[PDB]
Design a protein around this ligand. Structure first.
Ligand code: ADP
Ligand code: ADP
Ligand code: K
Ligand code: K
Ligand code: MG
Ligand code: MG
Ligand code: MG
Ligand code: MG
Lengths: 322, 324
């Protein structure tokens, strides 16, 4: 059984994805080759990918897409890319057309969970509590019916890139300008403050199994990029110090969202807790596997060891593809 | 300006796709090469693609994906691939990775508009009237809160394939079994009976312009596959006989849905009319271009001739990929 693991990517989460690949490669129990997508979109294979892994960033690649890769030599593809062009259904569409089993969410689930506006519309209709928000298109003025503080985001982002906590209505124009450098659509959400951030891992095809609930504790004004990936800046509380009824509701809501969106393989489902009210923040279908990442730690605490977790992901890929 | 037209596909709408390619190739005002995805997922190129188009079906292809062709030579790709894998975001995702402009909706809008459950969830959330429905997954006990008559559908279908009109609870099991031959998820909708069917074309990126409203009438119990593609079976009324307030309301609803879903390039937006009561039925991001298809006729009535409609689709693809 040969696995092809793809990491890097052209999204702002390129470096995060190479850290994820280091984590997965340390534990995956199958023979596994790495393929790296550089920041310019060109791929690196063989020894050049392993070199780029060691540098933790590859700004330039060798082969334009699609790469001269002998796909038939691999049984499963593990797309370990985060964000645009990797977690959003693009890579998944390519792999579906390749006819190759692959780890994680299909095209629709991936595209929808990446879009913070569309996912919120689906989940809100399904009865899942979400934060008040509006969508904003580039070149169009925002119509924000709620009062600040706000969070402003590109609709398709990850690792808090392009996100701003906005406290003045006057700072909203600059915040949207920054958001529009990453996407043609943005979301303005009502900021919850104070807020506790809860995350729960799901594993399985449509009908999921939930991990224990974890909590993110930090000092920064929000869980920003620097706080997410700088060692020691975030404390992951596993399991979270959470009252029993809320813990139960987090797991029920995560599994319901997972099923409604038809997610396969895995997701990390993230929630806000403010004044005793739960809100589903987002699903992430390719969660990070970095040394500061929550998803593998959550399942390790729930009795699913890191090599067992990757085995299940690979086996869920084979099972769905039949 | 060179176009690569892709048609065929592995979905049940493979033959309809080849018919649409015949119509687009007749009028497209650009040099256009044809690639055909055969029903087995292997591709046909060059002379074999044109031969297969003449045969109107291609069960067996030659080239495993990804096909041996230079994508760099094409300025735009026009996926004319109805249904699963072609209209549902899959081919769009591959084309995004090529860095290639392409006609029509992107990955998320394509995936949403092909799923009859998730599109309805988004549209209902935005306040768009839609028929009562539930989603049923394979192996799950169907929990339907309303009484029959039902319409049962594969969640990802087109051209009415796998759809049953269900009059009695006893007939629900056979209808779900039929729907589950095509998808792992199905929808059960409350049937409207009788009902008029309205369709409106949209053109543009996110902020579209609507064609005149057309209406489809027919003798069959519903707008089934045979009625859709038998010459003369379907009556296509353009403009629809509606009072002007209703016409504007249909066009505004189609543009609202188009914008909420983030559709690009084009869509045909289809509605039900039940003694004045309006429901959005579905959006189709790759509508048909067959000799009995509504989308080109609708924009024809709106003063956009067939070659100009196809030009604008290619122009809209270039305007989105570059610049945005
Ligand atoms: N509505 C909100 N209220 C409070 N904090 C928020 C809100 N939205 C985002 N944040 C903060 O920003 C972080 C990143 O937001 P998120 O939507 O998860 O984007 P990403 O997918 O990039 O992580 C969250 O973990 C949280 O710290
Ligand atoms: N809820 C409904 N009530 C009445 N007729 C329906 C309903 N749903 C579908 N139909 C009939 O079936 C046809 C096909 O259904 P539709 O959802 O548009 O699927 P497709 O994408 O296969 O065309 C419709 O044009 C209409 O004639
Ligand atoms: K996400
Ligand atoms: K559709
Ligand atoms: Mg995220
Ligand atoms: Mg997040
Ligand atoms: Mg349809
Ligand atoms: Mg239809």
């Amino acid at each position: 059984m040969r696995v092809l693991l793809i990491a890097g990517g052209v999204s702002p989460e390129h470096e995060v994805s190479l850290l994820s690949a280091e984590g997965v490669l340390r534990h995956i129990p199958f023979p596994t080759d790495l393929a790296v997508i550089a920041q310019d979109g060109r791929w690196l294979l063989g020894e050049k990918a392993l070199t780029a892994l060691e540098a933790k960033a590859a700004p330039e690649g060798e082969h334009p897409f699609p790469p001269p890769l002998s796909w038939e030599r691999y049984d499963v593809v593990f797309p370990l890319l985060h964000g645009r062009f990797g977690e959003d259904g693009t890579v998944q569409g390519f792999l579906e057309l390749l006819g190759k089993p692959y780890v994680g969410a299909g095209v629709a689930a991936s595209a929808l969970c990446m879009d913070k506006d569309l996912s919120k519309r689906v989940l809100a209709q399904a009865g899942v509590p979400v934060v008040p928000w509006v969508a904003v298109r580039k070149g169009e003025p925002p119509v924000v019916p709620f009062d600040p503080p706000f969070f402003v985001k590109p609709a398709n982002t990850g690792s808090s890139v392009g996100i701003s906590r906005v406290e003045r209505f006057q700072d909203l124009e600059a915040a949207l300008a920054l958001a529009f450098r990453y996407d043609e659509k943005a979301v303005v959400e009502k900021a919850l403050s104070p807020v506790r951030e809860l995350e729960v891992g799901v594993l399985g095809n449509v009908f999921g199994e939930a991990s224990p609930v974890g909590e993110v504790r930090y000092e920064a004004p929000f869980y920003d990029y620097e706080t997410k990936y700088t060692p020691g800046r975030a404390e992951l509380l596993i399991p979270a110090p959470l009252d029993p009824g809320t813990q139960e509701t987090v797991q029920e809501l995560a599994l319901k969202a997972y099923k409604v969106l038809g997610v396969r393989g895995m997701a990390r489902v993230d929630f806000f807790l403010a004044e005793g009210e739960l809100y589903l923040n987002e699903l992430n279908t390719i969660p990070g596997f970095t040394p500061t990442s929550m998803y593998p730690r959550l399942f390790e605490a729930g009795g699913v060891a890191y090599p067992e977790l990757l085995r299940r992901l690979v086996e869920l890929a084979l099972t769905h593809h039949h």
